[model samples]
Target: GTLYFGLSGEPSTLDTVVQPGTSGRTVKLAIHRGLVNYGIDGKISPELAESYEVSPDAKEFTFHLRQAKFHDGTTVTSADVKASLERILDPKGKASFRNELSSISKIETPDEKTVKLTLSTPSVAMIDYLALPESVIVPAAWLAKNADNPNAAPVGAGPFKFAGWTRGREITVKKFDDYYKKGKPDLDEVHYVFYSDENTRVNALKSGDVDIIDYVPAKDAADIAKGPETQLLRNTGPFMGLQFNTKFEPFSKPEVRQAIAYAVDRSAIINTAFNGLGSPIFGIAIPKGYMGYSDAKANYFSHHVEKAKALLAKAGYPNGFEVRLLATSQYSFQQNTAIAIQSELAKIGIKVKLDLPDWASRMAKASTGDYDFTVMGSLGEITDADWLSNYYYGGDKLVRTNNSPYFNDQQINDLLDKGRATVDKAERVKIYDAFVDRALELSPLVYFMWREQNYAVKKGVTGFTNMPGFLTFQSGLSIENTKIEHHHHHH
Candidate 1:
């Protein structure tokens, strides 16, 4: 017998190109395989590709592939690679990863198993780009047939084949008998049950209905750990934060944003609301395993009530002001953080109206810049500084809407452009340091706390890997000779 795990939410779509957020990564792991893979140690390694070489100028990439075949028994050729890249780069595709592929000039097939990519400029991050979630390859035939509908059923060369999906209930995948790799995916079947409520999910786990569960709420960490059949795994990374609608008045003042940041007590939220399951974060990166995270370095605004009050007075809000806090119940951590923020803001005389909606509806409201302030998160999109540079400080979606529907600054844009132009590590360090400093001064959004994730795993599960980027299960777990026995806890 073999064991399976449970995922947090339903994958909105099987097409990795259009689906946004963490769900996209889960779909990629189950449906498609990437050219390169990231190991548990955070190092790059070969996956479908046997080996790869980089040019001296760092503008060209060439990959040599191993013998691989899609689930439909079709050979994965260089043409498939070209088609995948083209799909990702096309603006009409509406892929959230469009900006990440901006440097790719052309993807050419020199031979049956060799694929070459030429970049517009030297980009050190391009290797990581290939290893990203969006880089998963789809079958060329499937892409052609589904040209009229991009969101059609996925076809790829991976350990698992898509069997079927029952909306709002579960998605079923079976082991691909013709899978490229040998002696893998011993489990006969894998089913991902979606639960919007954390209590329902945890209850399912307790009753032995679910073999494993991820994204257990911080508040329930202790109780979940106490379960006899499960063990908890905890690690820290980046998570949700506060953002202001700078396209309007009041929030147009950076000083006002800073004042609001100073008023909130993040320590209380982490200790009380989160039950100390998380660490207090000051900016974009977490204080653990990340390049820029530091406690000794005073990067952003800290909690100071009187100072926040004085700054408010100076900014023409002597008695504080009100703003809408848009959030969702789907993510328990985000919901808890918003409530904590509402209480903290009250002490500073700032009235906050919490608008709790489902994940989709909440995101739609934020995308329009309709709310004055809201909570959001970015899970290190590119595994590099580009995560912050592209999303928070880049052209259109830059947190404050400074470039779109608001005032634009030439200096900030210049720094951002220079950051993306170079491939040198030292240059990136300098660029990001300046970007964080300016962003802090501008106060478009207050960089909030990093996430501390907790999960419960069944005793015998091994080789399963979890990262901030992807909640992957395909390459991680190998249940060759495991056994399962019914326990009397529940079901």
Candidate 2:
């Protein structure tokens, strides 16, 4: 049976290494297989690697490749793994996520099946990063041929092989006969249909044009749940918030930042924007359920208009100041959140000029620190808090952005270093707790809520499950295991 899934947007590229958005990663997952993957329970598990080991110091890693074959029918080898990683790490490669592997000092392939990775320092987040779509293994020969244009024709050893893609229409993948996981992926084909409009996608699901749809609007969740032909599946993990360009004036002042944080009515935003489908986020980074999560300490700010006004006055903003708030028009949640924030800040005399640009334009502005403040969303992919902390303090992409307001703090940096260096779960938690405290004290960003991913699927669509890791919805989707009873669609 062919399972029709609705994709919110068309992937910009098929190459996972350079794909910039979640939509692209979703498509790449069907065409590539990483060494490790997150299971349905959100725990890390072996994928292409049959087994692996790490040194006592946690600086060296060894992986044994499974007997898998690429879409082109070549056996998987250690060289392919090494080459894939090398390309991703290459400065000339221009990979958007190259910094994710910045700690890798060297990669060695002692044999066809054995791959060893040596890091310059102990990186606790390395293993989890390896499970990302960027780390998906590809044949060395295919890499050489498609180095200039990997997205032109994608290939990998996964449960499915890319069949074709009609931009703005649909992407098709057929079951891979040689998939390493035997007696699995019960379906013969999967189709990802593009639907830019949420309502249109929902309509398609109801009409049986598609078997499943993701990124469901919260307002429609109840109606969809009551539908006879549809079932609503929900998982809470993704988060959204307003990030400030701390380097800019007003925001550069801690009191000013804290004032805005205090002014935010997180619950109100969730109720209005998400239809009360989200939970309040106390910390600026990482959601609950991750290591270093503290319910007690995360209660750093609450809705206090009087306190916020007093703080702003103390910071010499008694007359209030104007700033532009940027957000992408692609997602209604972001637009709604920005509007809510604008209204809330107005109560404290802060004038907000809302700008809703296209997704690419908004991302470019945020990456360059071109805006005073912006609404953003992130997926809680790893179980470790370090994954979230790294973005804020590791001197990584987010911190190093052209207009980034994050100035290096020695105490926070030291805490992060210590947190990831230790292997003890308890030790790591203590370190992260301190880190969270320090981060909240700084108030670099104003957090809103951790959202729940809602999906609508047709009845009789069995064997479909959402994985618990980063971009959990699409990342964990097992299209091969998905089945539709009384199949009627042809091609």
Candidate 3:
């Protein structure tokens, strides 16, 4: 049986190491097997590597490759792992996730089956990084051949092998008979059908054109749940928030940023934008329940309209100012959130002009900080709080790209470094607690709600469950365990 899955958009690239967006990562997970992966219960589990050991210092790692074969029938070896890691770390390779591996000092292939890594310093989040799709091992020979164009074709050793991809249409993958996981990937084939419109994707599921669809519209979740033949799987992980460019005036003033933060009513945004399928967040990117979350019952900007007005006046914006809020028209949630923010800011004498562009266009503009502010959602990619901290406030990457306007501060930088360097979980937690408190004081980004992720599936689909922790959708983990039982009738 073939499982037709609805995808929100065409993958920007098949090369997971270079393009790690949610869409691309989903496809990559189907075709590639990482060294380690998050189990259904969110614990780290071995995939390509049978097992691994860490040195007492937590600076060296040794992995033993499993007796597996790639789609091309090539034996998986330590050399492949070494080459893959090195390629991703290479500056010329242009891997977006290279920063995560900067701690690696050297990689050695002691034998065909053993791979060892020595780190420059202790990295508490090293295992979490390896679980990322970007760490999937690729055949060294394939990399050498497709050095110039890796995305043109994908070759990996996973349960499913890429068969063909039709741009803007569908990507097809066939069951790899040689898959290490015996008798797995129950379906004969998997079809990832692309649909940019949410309604179109939902309709496809209702029409039986697709068996499963991710990113289910929050407004439509209840209806899908009511349908006898369909099931709504929901998980709270991803978050949406407004980012302020702190490099310029107005936003540069902490009071001004704080005012805008106070102006937002998180409950209203969650109710309107997510159909009440979300929880309010105080920190920037770290979702609730994750380590390093704030213990404060109420944040600095807990919806005080009068306080917001006073702050704006203190910032010398007594008459209010006009600023553009950019967001993609691709998702209704983002558009709705932008509209809600616009209405809320108006109360404080600020005029917000909405700039709704296509997803690609909006991302391009946001990458260069070409707009005043934007509404965006992120999965945070990895489970560690350091991942979010590094992206938003760690180094010059955010500033160099104009993605953030945060000025450098020695104290914040030290705390971030301490969080990543400490091997003790309790110590790291303390560092993160301080980090979140300081970040809230600065109010770099408006604290919004942590939106719940929803996926719709036909009744006969089995084993497709949403994993806890960093996993986004069911696809974020393993699809090999998913199966379709057509004979089972649902009424």
Candidate 4:
């Protein structure tokens, strides 16, 4: 039995420690196992670790491993866990999880089954980062021998073992008989074939060449949804919006930023970019089900052209100003959003000159905070209150970040740090209540709306879940849970 999964793009790297995009991440759950892993419900649960505990202060974390084994047949122990983490923590390497694990002051293996981690400060997101499939566990011996090439016959204690990878084409994986989790990974094999062109990917699915296809283009979503045999699995947690280079003139003032936030119609952007499949983000893009959610804060921004004009006038820009709006021509949604924003800002006297470039060049410019403002479409991997760290809490220099590179506030950063320490839900809401208020008021990065992401699958394919909330980006971490019926597996 084989499941043909169509990946939107080829994985640049298969090494667990290296950062990979969404398509690359989708197949990892079958090939690797982390100490903690996210469930189909988007909750973090034990995988390599049988049970774990954290001190009340959240400074110390202890894990008890199961009787697990690497794909190489070596037993997984505390030493293996320590070694993998140390390898990532090494400053010389560019491991993706390095920054996330930076707060860890020490990693100690008290025994073969026990691993302990002590952090310099309490970090609530520490566990969430560990749940990422990229934070995989590997045998120390195997890693050490292949230090120069971790992807050389990569091994982990996952439900599936790597079978083969043909660069730029397909990656094949097979079920591991010795997998720790019993009676799982029902599919005998998975053929992750890359379909770089989205239309060809959907056509392949519609033509029965693929059992499932990820990243269904929004423009084609409605038509696909109406198809007789195809099922669309959609999640609306990823977002798109504008970011500013605060160092530039006219944008340094909070009033100007706030005015821009009010001037634009979020629904128009949604209609233009997403075919009206997503919701407007009037406030900070916090998930309603998450701990940091506040109704008052979520409704903080509303479109009012008069209010926008008054704000621009107050900010000493009565006769609108011209600024460069950077976006990419590579992604149609981004280009459309930029055009929609340009059209709206024109009404308020702001002249927006579009700087549309290729995806790589756009990212390079966005990384350096090179534009007056730009459009960003991204997802938050962590679902907790601490997820705010990526978009709002810039520590020192406000540039070259994962998100909101040019936006930073001391109070917000402090509140995020405080948000990390408090384990109580009530305390988190209280802390974030003030945090969201000030964060929205400043409007450093004005948000547009939540963006809908879709995955099309054959109707018979079961057990695949598009994880709700901010966990949408990490949806591929659940490949182990996906199942295909016996008759339809050979596609």
Give the count of colliding residue pairs in each prediction.
0, 2, 0, 0
What ordering of candidates by TM-score runs from best to worst? 2, 3, 4, 1
Put down candidate 2 lDDT per residue, 241-345, tens digits, no spaces. Answer: 767787668987879888988888888789988998888876664655667776677677877899999999999999899999998667788888999989999
Which runs of model 3 end up more than 4 angstroms from their true locations? 283-288, 399-407, 473-476, 487-491
lDDT of 2: 0.77
Name the top lDDT candidate.
4
Please list the C-alpha lDDT of all candidates, in the order they appear: 0.67, 0.77, 0.78, 0.81
Window of ten residues with lowest summed lDDT in model 2: 396-405
lDDT, model 1, position 50: 86
Report per-prediction Cα RMSD to one decimal.
Answer: 3.6, 2.5, 2.9, 3.1
Better of 3 and 4 by TM-score: 3
Comparison by TM-score, 1 against 3, better one: 3
TM-score per model over all chains? 0.87, 0.93, 0.92, 0.89
Error of 2 at 208 (Å): 1.4
Better of 2 and 3 by TM-score: 2
lDDT of 1 by residue, 210-251 (tens): 776777777777877785667776556555567666665777
